[PDB]
Design a protein around this ligand. Structure first.
Ligand SMILES: Nc1ncnc2c1ncn2[C@@H]1O[C@H](COP(=O)(O)OP(=O)(O)O)[C@@H](O)[C@H]1O
Ligand SMILES: [Mg+2]
Ligand SMILES: [Mg+2]
Lengths: 180, 77, 525, 60, 181, 232, 149, 190
C-alpha cells in the first residue's frame, strides 16, 4: 500500500455479541433469513465506517474470546481494497502506536481519520524463501522508536548477533548516562 | 498359646473351621488377664508421673510431626 | 514397669515412647543444637548462613536473621520445633530478638541439663527460674528509660536503635545511610504502625549505597496507550471499580432476542453504559485515575481521549498505599463526586530504574506511605537487605508505639543476671542453684556476642559483671575496639519491648521444654 | 552450551554463559547473580565483573 | 419399659441412647423421648431451651429458602417481575413459618432440614426448632407426645400437634440432648 | 457457695484445677477468668452451662499475662474497607445474613433482556438496589453493620460514603455470638431491619498484633452480654 | 410426563401457588381413593411423602411391593386389578381380604393378607426353622409334595 | 558363560545338567450404529438383538433422566454449601472460581459453557472467588474444583497449571476427565 493510512482497532469485526449470555431465538423461517441478512448488514456497516476515513491498512488486535475478523468482514475489507493484518498482540500496541502515530480504536464510533497513522509505504516483503515481513517504511510524525532486522544463516549465529547488538546498544546507553 | 484351633483332624483330612485360622491368634484364660493387667499397668505408670502440681508433661508428636505438650490425661491418651 | 520396655509393646508399628532420661536427652540435645546453629550470627560481628534448599528450585538464601534460618530448616526434634516456633512468634511480635531468644532458651536448657545432672528436680528448677524471671523483669523495667517526650532526644533514640538493629546485619557496611532511611521511613507514617504502608522495591544492579527512600512514591504499574505520560498538579481518583466488560451483577440476566439487529443495539447499550461510567468518573475533575482492577480497551480509549492518565491493575496494597500517600479515597461509585475525596501530588512522571520503568508520584500530599528502592549486586544481597530493613522498621515502629528503651551490648542481660544473682544468694535451697544457672545463661548471651567478634569473652564479661556489681548499670561491650564502655555515650540502645519479649519468651519456652519427661511419637505418615 | 533439552547456545556473553550452565554451588550462583546485575546496570562487562570477583576471592 | 409398649411390643418403640461418660447407675429411662441435638444453625442459642407445657409440631418439611422445585425454571423479562419473584420465594417460606407459628406449637421438629432463616425466625418468636431429626426419633416423639407427622403445614390443628408436660435441652456427658418428658 | 458475690471458693477450686498446668504462672489470673466466664454464661438455677457461649481464642504473641476475659466477642476479621474507622463507640449493630448484593432467587431463573430499555432498566435496578440497601441500613439508625456473606465494591464504597463501618464474612457461630452478646436479632434481609432488631456494643475496635498485618475485631462493653470470650 | 417436565413460572403468583396446587391435587387423588371405600393401598412403585401424609390422614394402610411378581400374586390373591393410574378403583377393580395386618413372626416383620375361607387363588406355607439350610431343604421337600399333587 | 550361548548342542547339554540357566457384534454398536445396518444382522441374531436394543434403549432413557441441567450456572457464596457440598448424591460437580477481570478465566468459562451442553450429566457452576471465599488471593485463578458427594476430587489451581492461554476446549476437557468427572472419549492431545 502506497500513501498508507493505518488504523489499529481493538474491537472485533464479527457478528454482534453482548458481554452477557446472548441468544437469537428463531421461531419462523422469516427470522431465520433476517438473521443472516442483518448480520451481513452489521458487518458491512462496520467495514464502511472504516473505509470512509480513507484507511487502506488495518491492524487488528488479537482477540481470544470472539472472532476478531470474520470471513465476511475479510471479504468486505478485500473488496474495499484495504490491507488487513490480524493477530496483532496486545503487548505490541504501545510500540505500534509509538512507531506510526496511530491511536488504538476500541469502539467503531471513534474510528475517525484523526486516529490513523500516515506512512509513506506499507509492504509485505519476502525474505528470499525464508519467510515474509510486514514492513512499514516512512511515517509522518516519526516516533522515538526503531526496529533492527537481524539476518543470519543459523539460529545460533543469529542469537549471538542479537546479543552482540544488545551489548553495543547498552554501551551507547552507558554513554548517554555518566558521560565519561 | 495362640493360633486358635490346631488339630488338622485325627483321620488326616483338612480341619478348617475359622477363616484365616492360621493367620489368627487367640489368648485364653489367666494369661489373657495377665496381658490385660500388664497393658493397663504400663499405661497407668506412664500417666502417673503427670499427676499433681509437681507432675511433668508429655510431648506428643502426631503423624505429620506437629508437637503437643500436655499434662491432660485425655489429650495424652 | 514402662510403656515401651514392657514384656508387651503397646503401640502401633512405627511409634515409640522415650522415657524420663531419654526424653530429656533428646529434648536438651535438640534445643542446644538449634541454639548452637543460630548463634555465631549474634552481634555486630555475626556471620551469615547459607540456606541452600534442596527443592526442585534449590532456593538460595544468605541470612543472619535467626527467625528465617529456623523457619528454613527441616527439623525433626520436637523441642527444636518448640524453639523454632518461639523464634517465629518473636518475629511476629517484634522484628528483632529471634536469635537472642533462641540462644537464650538454648543456654537455659543447657544449664538445666547441667542441673538435672546435679540430681535436681526440674520443678525446683522451674520454680527458681520463675523467681529469676520476676527479678529480671523488675530489673529491666527499672533500668528502662523513656524519651518520647523530648522530640530531639526521641529522634536520637530512633537513630541509635535503627543503627543497633542494622549493626548485626549486612547493612552495617553502610549503616548510617540505611539508618537514616529507616528512621525517615518510620517517621513518614506519622504515628501509624502499618508496615504494609512501607513498600520496598528490590531492583537488581547498582551498589547497596544506591539505595534510597523516595521523597514521593513509586508504583511498578503501566500507563495506558494513548494516555499522557507526565502530569503536573495531578488530581487523582483511586478506584476499585470493574472497567472490565462490566456486567450487571444479575446473573440470570441474559440477552434473548429474535434479530441480530437487537443484539447489536444491546452491545451498543453496553458500550454506552461503560462510556457513561467513564463520564461519571471524569465529572470528578481529575487528571489521573488509578484502578485496582484492569481497564479494558474501550475505557482506556476514553481516558486517553479525555487526557487522563489511567493506571491499572494496582493491587489492594497498591491502592491502599496510594490513598495513604496522596490523600484520595478508594471509590467504586461516582454518582456523588462532592463526597469523593481526590488525591494530590505535584507531579506524576515515568522514571527509569535499572531496565524497568515506574510511575513516580512526587510532591505527594500526605506521605503516610513510603517506597524504598533497594539496589544490590545479587538477589541474595537484595533479600538480606530487605529482611534487615524489615527488622529495623519493625523495631522503630515498636519504639514509636512504646518509647521505652534499654541499653544493649550485654548491659541489659548482665543487669538482669545481677538481679537474679542477688535473689539467688538471698534465697535458700536448690532454687538458689537454679537462679544461679538462670544468671549464667543471661551472662552467656554477651559472652557469645563477644566470642563472635574474637575478643576475650571471659575477660570482657568478667569486667562487665564486676561493673554491674559495682553499680555502673550502663557498662556494656564496645565492639569497635573490643572493650567495655558507656552504652549511653556510644548509642547502643534497644527497644524495651524487644528485650522484655526476648527474656519472657525464652524463659517460657525453656519452662515448657523442661516440664517434659516423656515423648510419645506416633507412626509417621 | 547444550542445556537439559536439545537447546544449543553458542555465546561469548558472561551473563548468558553463567545463567545457561546451572552451577549448583551457592557462591557460583551468587556470581551468576553478579553477572546479571552487571548486565542490568551496564550491559557489557559481564565477564570482567565475574573474573574480578573470582580474582578478589582467590586473593582472599 | 416393656409395660409401656402397647400391644406389639415393638423394639423400635424403645429407644436406646449411649452417652459416653458416667456410671451404669447414672443411666436412666425417660417415659417420653430423648434424642441428640441435630446440627443447629445460627440463632439456635438465641432460642429458649425449656418449655413447661409445649405443643409440638412434628413435620416432614424442609424449612429454608430453596428452589421451589428442581425441575422448576422461572422466566421473567422485567426487573419488577424479578423483584416480585424474589419476594415470592421469601413469602413462600415466611408463610410456612407463619402457619407453623400460629398453630400454637412452641416446639418444631422436622425430619428434613430447617435452614438458618427459619432457625432465626423461630428464635425471634421464642420457639424451638430442630431439623434433620432421625425418622425413628420422630416416630417415637409421635407415639409419646401424641401427634402426627405432617409433610404440609397447611392444616396444623391441635389434633395433629403433639404435647408434653416438659421439654428441655440438657447436657449429658459432653453431648446435648433434647428431652420430651 | 456458688454465688457471684463470693467467688473465692470458686477461685480456690479453679486454682486447684490449674495448679497442675503450665498456666499456673498466672495462676489466679487464669482461675478468676474461668470463674467469671462460667458465671457470665450460665442459667445458675443449678441448670446447665453451655460452653458454646464461651469463645476460647488464641493468638501467638504477647504474654500469658495478656490472656483476658472479654465480656463480649472477638472475631478474626477487620472492617471491610481500609479507610473505615478502626474504633466505634456506642455502636448500634445491624446483624445480617444477606450479602450486600442484588437479590437472586434460589429457583433457577432467567431474566430476559429484549431491548435497550430492558438493559437500562436492569442497570438502574442494580444501582437502586445498592442505594436502597444502604439507605435501609442507615434509616434503622445503625452505626455498624455485620454481614455473614460478604459484599461487593459498590456496597463497600456506599457503606464508607455513608459512614457505616461494616464487617463481612463473619461466620455463623460468630454471628450468633455477636447477636447474643449485643442483644441484637439476626436479620435475613434489609427490608426486615428495624431499630429494635439492632444490638448495642459499647466498644467495637480493630486490634493489631505488632508486625503481623493481622487484625481482629473486639466487641465489648455490652450491657448484659450472655456471651463471653477468653483471649489467650 | 414421559417426555420431560419443566415448571415454567413467569409470575410471583404462579410461584406462590404451585406447591399448594400440588398438595391439593394429591389430597384430591387420595381422598377419591379413600372415598371409594379402600382402606388398604398396595403400590408397586415408590411412595411420595405428601401422598403418604394424606394416606395417613384418611386412614389407609400403605404397602409397597418392590417386585412385580409379588404384585401380580397379590392381585390373584385378593381379587384385584393392578391400576396403571392413580384413579380410584371401580367396584370390580377392588380386592378384598378378611384381614390385612402387620405382624412379627420371630425377629421378622411381615405384612399378612389373610382370608378366613379355606380357599383362594394363592396359599402360603410359613416355614419355621432353626437354620436357613434346614428351611431350604424343607422348601425343597414342599416342592416335591406340590409337584406330586 | 565360558562360551557364547548360541544354537549349539554344548549349551543344550549344559542346560540339561543345570548350568547356563535358560464391527465386533451388535452388543457394542450404539443406537445409531444399530440403525446403520439393520439388514446385515441375521434374524436368529435379531432375536437377541431385540433384547440388546431394549437394554440400550433403557440405558439411554436412564441417561435422559440423569441429564438434569446441562448448562453452566453461577452460585453466590451464600448458597455454595447447598449447591456444592450438598449437591445431588453421586453427582459430579465442577466449580470454576473466577473473576470476570482475568481473561483466562473468561476463556475457561467459555470452554465450560461448551462442555456443559456437551456433558449434560455433570453439574457445571461458576462463582466469583472473592464472593465464595473470604479474601481469596488475586493471583490464584482460575480455580477448577472437582467435587463428588461434597468431597473435593480434584483442584486445578493457578493461572499456570491450568494449561496456558492456548487452552482449547479439548485439553481442558481432558484435565476435567482426569479425576473421572466428565468422562470424555479421547487422550491428552496438547
Ligand atoms: N556497637 C555495638 N556494641 C555492642 N553491642 C552491639 C552493638 N551493635 C549491636 N550490638 C548488639 O548486637 C546484638 C545484635 O543482635 P541480633 O543479631 O539483632 O539479635 P536477634 O537476631 O536476636 O535480634 C544486639 O543484641 C545488641 O545488643
Ligand atoms: Mg537485630
Ligand atoms: Mg486437674
Amino acid at each position: 500500500v502506497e500513501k498508507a493510512k493505518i488504523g489499529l482497532i481493538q474491537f472485533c469485526l464479527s457478528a454482534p455479541k453482548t458481554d452477557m449470555d446472548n441468544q437469537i431465538v428463531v421461531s419462523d423461517y422469516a427470522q431465520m433469513d433476517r438473521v443472516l441478512r442483518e448480520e451481513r448488514a452489521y458487518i458491512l456497516n462496520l467495514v464502511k465506517q472504516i473505509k470512509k476515513t480513507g484507511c487502506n491498512v488495518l491492524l487488528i488486535q488479537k482477540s481470544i474470546l470472539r472472532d476478531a475478523l470474520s470471513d465476511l468482514a475479510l471479504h468486505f475489507l478485500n473488496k474495499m481494497k484495504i490491507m488487513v493484518i490480524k493477530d496483532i498482540e496486545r503487548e505490541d500496541i504501545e510500540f505500534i502506536c509509538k512507531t506510526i502515530g496511530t491511536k488504538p480504536v476500541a469502539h467503531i464510533d471513534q474510528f475517525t481519520a484523526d486516529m490513523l497513522g500516515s506512512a509513506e509505504l506499507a509492504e509485505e516483503v519476502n525474505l528470499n524463501g525464508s519467510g515474509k515481513l510486514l514492513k512499514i517504511t516512512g511515517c509522518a510524525s516519526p516516533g522515538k522508536t526503531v526496529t533492527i532486522v537481524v539476518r543470519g544463516s543459523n539460529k545460533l549465529v543469529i542469537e549471538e548477533a542479537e546479543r552482540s547488538i544488545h551489548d553495543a546498544l547498552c554501551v551507547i546507553r552507558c554513554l548517554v548516562k555518566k558521560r565519561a | 498359646a495362640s493360633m486358635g484351633t490346631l488339630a488338622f483332624d485325627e483321620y488326616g483330612r483338612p480341619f478348617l473351621i475359622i477363616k484365616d485360622q492360621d493367620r489368627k491368634s487367640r489368648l485364653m484364660g489367666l494369661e489373657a488377664l495377665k496381658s490385660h493387667i500388664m497393658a493397663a499397668k504400663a499405661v497407668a505408670n506412664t500417666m502417673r508421673t503427670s499427676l499433681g502440681p509437681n507432675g511433668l508433661d508429655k510431648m506428643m508428636v502426631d503423624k505429620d510431626g506437629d508437637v503437643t505438650v500436655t499434662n491432660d490425661g485425655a489429650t495424652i491418651l | 514397669a514402662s510403656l515401651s520396655l514392657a514384656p508387651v509393646n503397646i503401640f502401633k508399628a512405627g511409634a515409640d515412647e522415650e522415657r524420663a532420661e531419654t526424653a530429656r536427652l533428646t529434648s536438651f540435645i535438640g534445643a542446644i543444637a538449634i541454639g548452637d546453629l543460630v548463634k555465631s550470627t549474634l552481634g555486630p560481628k555475626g556471620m551469615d548462613k547459607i540456606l541452600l534448599s534442596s527443592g526442585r528450585d534449590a532456593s538460595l538464601m544468605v541470612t543472619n536473621d535467626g527467625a528465617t534460618i529456623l523457619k528454613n530448616i527441616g527439623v525433626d526434634n520436637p523441642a527444636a520445633k518448640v524453639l523454632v516456633d518461639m523464634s517465629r512468634v518473636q518475629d511476629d511480635e517484634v522484628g528483632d530478638g529471634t536469635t537472642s531468644v533462641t540462644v537464650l532458651a538454648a543456654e537455659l536448657l543447657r544449664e538445666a541439663e547441667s542441673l538435672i545432672a546435679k540430681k535436681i528436680h526440674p520443678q525446683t528448677i522451674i520454680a527458681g527460674w520463675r523467681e529469676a524471671t520476676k527479678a529480671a523483669r523488675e530489673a529491666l523495667l527499672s533500668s528502662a528509660v523513656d524519651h518520647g517526650s523530648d522530640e530531639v532526644k526521641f529522634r536520637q533514640d530512633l537513630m541509635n536503635i535503627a543503627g543497633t538493629t542494622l549493626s548485626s546485619k549486612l547493612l552495617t557496611h553502610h549503616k548510617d545511610h540505611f539508618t537514616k532511611l529507616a528512621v525517615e521511613a518510620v517517621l513518614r507514617l506519622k504515628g501509624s504502625g502499618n508496615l504494609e504502608a512501607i513498600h520496598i522495591i528490590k531492583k537488581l544492579g547498582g551498589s547497596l549505597a544506591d539505595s534510597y527512600l523516595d521523597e514521593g512514591f513509586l508504583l511498578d504499574k503501566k500507563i495506558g496507550v494513548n494516555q499522557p505520560k507526565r502530569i503536573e498538579n495531578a488530581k487523582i481518583l483511586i478506584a476499585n471499580t470493574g472497567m472490565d466488560t462490566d456486567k450487571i451483577k444479575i446473573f440470570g440476566s441474559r440477552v434473548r432476542v429474535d434479530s441480530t439487529a437487537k443484539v447489536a443495539e444491546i452491545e451498543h447499550a453496553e458500550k454506552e453504559k461503560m462510556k457513561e461510567k467513564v463520564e461519571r468518573i471524569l465529572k470528578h475533575g481529575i487528571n489521573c485515575f488509578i484502578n485496582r482492577q484492569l481497564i479494558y480497551n474501550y475505557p482506556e480509549q476514553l481516558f486517553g481521549a479525555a487526557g487522563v492518565m489511567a493506571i491499572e491493575h494496582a493491587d489492594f496494597a497498591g491502592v491502599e498505599r496510594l490513598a495513604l500517600v496522596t490523600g484520595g479515597e478508594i471509590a467504586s461509585t461516582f454518582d456523588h463526586p462532592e463526597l469523593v475525596k481526590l488525591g494530590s501530588c505535584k507531579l506524576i512522571e515515568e522514571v527509569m530504574i535499572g531496565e524497568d520503568k515506574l510511575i513516580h508520584f512526587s510532591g505527594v500530599a500526605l506521605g503516610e506511605a513510603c517506597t524504598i528502592v533497594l539496589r544490590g549486586a545479587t538477589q541474595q544481597i537484595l533479600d538480606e537487605a530487605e529482611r534487615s530493613l524489615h527488622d529495623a522498621l519493625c523495631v522503630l515502629a515498636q519504639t514509636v508505639k512504646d518509647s521505652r528503651t534499654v541499653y544493649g551490648g550485654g548491659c541489659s542481660e548482665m543487669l538482669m543476671a545481677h538481679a537474679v544473682t542477688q535473689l539467688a544468694n538471698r534465697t535458700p535451697g536448690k532454687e538458689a542453684v537454679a537462679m544461679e544457672s538462670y544468671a549464667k545463661a543471661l551472662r552467656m548471651l554477651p559472652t557469645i556476642i563477644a566470642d563472635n567478634a574474637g575478643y576475650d569473652s571471659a575477660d570482657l564479661v568478667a569486667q562487665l559483671r564486676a561493673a554491674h556489681s559495682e553499680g555502673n548499670t550502663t557498662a556494656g561491650l564496645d565492639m569497635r575496639e573490643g572493650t567495655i564502655g558507656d552504652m549511653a555515650i556510644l548509642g547502643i540502645t534497644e527497644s524495651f519491648q524487644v528485650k522484655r519479649q526476648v527474656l519472657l519468651s525464652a524463659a517460657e519456652a525453656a519452662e515448657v521444654i523442661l516440664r517434659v519427661d516423656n515423648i510419645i511419637k506416633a507412626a509417621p505418615r | 552450551i547444550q542445556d537439559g533439552k536439545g537447546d544449543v547456545t553458542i555465546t561469548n556473553d558472561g551473563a548468558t554463559i553463567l545463567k545457561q550452565m546451572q552451577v549448583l554451588h551457592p557462591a557460583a550462583r551468587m556470581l551468576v547473580e553478579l553477572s546479571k546485575a552487571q548486565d542490568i546496570e551496564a550491559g557489557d562487562g559481564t565477564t570482567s565483573v565475574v573474573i574480578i570477583a573470582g580474582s578478589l576471592l582467590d586473593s582472599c | 419399659a416393656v409395660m409401656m409398649l402397647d400391644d406389639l411390643l415393638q423394639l423400635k418403640m424403645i429407644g436406646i441412647k449411649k452417652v459416653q461418660g458416667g456410671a451404669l447407675e447414672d443411666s436412666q429411662l425417660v417415659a417420653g423421648v430423648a434424642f441428640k441435638k441435630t446440627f443447629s444453625y445460627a440463632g439456635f442459642e438465641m432460642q429458649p431451651k425449656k418449655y413447661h407445657n409445649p405443643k409440638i409440631a412434628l413435620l416432614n418439611v424442609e424449612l429454608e429458602l430453596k428452589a421451589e422445585k428442581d425441575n422448576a425454571e422461572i422466566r421473567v423479562h422485567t426487573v419488577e417481575d424479578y423483584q416480585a419473584i424474589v419476594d415470592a420465594e421469601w413469602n413462600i417460606l415466611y408463610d410456612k413459618l407463619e402457619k407453623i407459628h400460629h398453630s400454637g406449637a412452641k416446639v418444631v421438629l422436622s425430619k428434613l432440614p430447617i435452614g438458618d432463616v427459619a432457625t432465626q425466625y423461630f428464635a425471634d418468636r421464642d420457639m424451638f426448632c430442630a431439623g434433620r431429626v432421625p425418622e425413628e426419633d420422630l416416630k417415637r416423639t409421635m407415639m409419646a407426645c401424641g401427634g402426627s407427622i405432617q409433610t404440609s403445614v397447611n392444616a396444623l390443628s391441635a389434633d395433629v400437634l403433639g404435647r408434653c408436660q416438659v421439654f428441655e435441652e440438657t447436657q449429658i456427658g459432653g453431648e446435648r440432648y433434647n428431652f420430651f418428658t | 457457695l456458688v454465688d457471684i458475690k463470693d467467688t473465692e471458693p470458686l477461685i480456690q477450686t479453679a486454682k486447684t484445677t490449674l495448679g497442675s498446668k503450665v498456666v499456673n504462672s498466672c495462676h489466679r489470673q487464669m482461675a478468676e477468668i474461668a470463674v467469671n466466664a462460667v458465671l457470665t454464661v450460665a442459667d445458675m438455677e443449678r441448670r446447665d452451662v453451655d460452653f458454646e457461649l464461651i469463645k476460647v481464642e488464641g493468638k501467638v504473641g504477647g504474654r500469658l499475662e495478656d490472656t483476658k476475659l472479654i465480656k463480649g466477642v472477638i472475631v478474626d476479621k477487620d472492617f471491610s474497607h481500609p479507610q473505615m474507622p478502626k474504633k466505634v463507640e456506642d455502636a448500634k449493630i445491624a446483624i445480617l445474613t444477606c450479602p450486600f448484593e442484588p437479590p437472586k432467587p434460589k429457583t433457577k431463573h432467567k431474566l430476559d433482556v429484549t431491548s435497550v430499555e430492558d438493559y437500562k432498566a436492569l442497570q438502574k435496578y442494580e444501582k437502586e438496589k445498592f442505594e436502597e440497601m444502604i439507605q435501609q441500613i442507615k434509616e434503622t439508625g445503625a452505626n455498624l453493620a455485620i454481614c455473614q456473606w460478604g459484599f461487593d465494591d459498590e456496597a463497600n464504597h456506599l457503606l464508607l460514603q455513608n459512614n457505616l463501618p461494616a464487617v463481612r464474612w463473619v461466620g455463623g457461630p460468630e454471628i450468633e455470638l455477636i447477636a447474643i452478646a449485643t442483644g441484637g436479632r439476626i436479620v435475613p434481609r434489609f427490608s426486615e431491619l428495624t431499630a429494635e432488631k439492632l444490638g448495642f456494643a459499647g466498644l467495637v475496635q480493630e486490634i493489631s498484633f505488632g508486625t503481623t498485618k493481622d487484625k481482629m475485631l473486639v466487641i465489648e462493653q455490652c450491657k448484659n452480654s450472655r456471651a463471653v470470650t477468653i483471649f489467650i | 410426563t414421559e417426555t420431560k417436565g419443566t415448571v415454567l413460572i413467569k409470575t410471583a403468583e404462579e410461584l406462590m401457588n404451585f406447591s399448594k396446587g400440588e398438595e391439593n391435587l394429591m389430597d384430591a387423588q387420595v381422598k377419591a381413593i379413600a372415598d371409594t371405600g379402600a382402606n388398604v393401598v398396595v403400590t408397586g412403585g415408590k411412595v411420595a411423602d405428601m401422598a403418604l401424609h394424606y394416606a395417613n390422614k384418611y386412614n389407609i394402610m400403605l404397602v409397597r411391593l418392590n417386585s412385580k411378581w409379588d404384585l401380580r400374586r397379590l392381585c390373584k390373591t385378593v381379587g384385584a386389578t393392578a391400576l396403571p393410574r392413580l384413579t380410584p378403583p371401580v367396584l370390580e377393580e377392588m380386592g378384598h381380604c378378611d384381614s390385612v395386618y402387620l405382624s412379627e413372626v420371630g425377629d421378622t416383620q411381615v405384612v399378612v393378607f389373610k382370608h378366613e375361607k379355606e380357599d383362594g387363588a394363592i396359599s402360603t406355607i410359613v416355614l419355621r426353622g432353626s437354620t436357613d439350610n434346614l428351611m431350604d431343604d424343607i422348601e425343597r421337600a414342599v416342592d416335591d409334595g406340590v409337584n406330586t399333587f | 558363560m565360558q562360551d557364547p550361548n548360541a544354537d549349539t548342542e554344548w549349551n543344550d547339554i549344559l542346560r540339561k545338567k543345570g548350568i547356563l540357566p535358560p464391527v465386533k457384534t451388535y452388543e457394542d454398536m450404539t443406537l445409531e450404529e444399530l440403525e446403520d445396518h439393520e439388514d446385515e444382522f441375521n434374524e436368529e441374531d435379531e432375536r437377541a438383538i431385540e433384547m440388546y436394543r431394549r437394554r440400550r434403549l433403557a440405558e439411554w432413557k436412564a441417561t435422559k433422566l440423569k441429564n438434569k441441567f446441562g448448562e453452566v450456572l453461577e452460585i453466590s457464596g451464600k448458597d455454595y454449601v447447598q449447591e456444592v457440598t450438598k449437591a445431588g448424591e453421586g453427582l459430579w460437580v465442577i466449580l470454576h472460581l473466577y473473576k470476570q477481570g482475568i481473561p483466562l478465566c473468561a476463556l475457561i468459562n467459555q470452554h465450560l459453557s461448551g462442555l456443559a451442553r456437551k456433558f449434560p450429566d455433570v453439574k457445571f457452576i461458576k462463582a466469583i472467588s472473592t464472593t465464595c471465599i473470604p479474601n481469596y488471593p488475586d493471583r490464584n485463578l482460575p480455580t477448577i474444583f472437582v467435587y463428588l458427594e461434597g468431597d473435593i476430587k480434584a483442584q486445578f489451581i493457578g493461572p499456570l497449571v491450568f494449561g496456558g492461554m492456548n487452552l482449547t476446549r479439548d485439553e481442558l476437557e481432558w484435565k476435567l476427565s482426569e479425576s473421572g468427572a466428565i468422562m470424555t472419549d479421547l487422550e491428552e492431545n496438547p
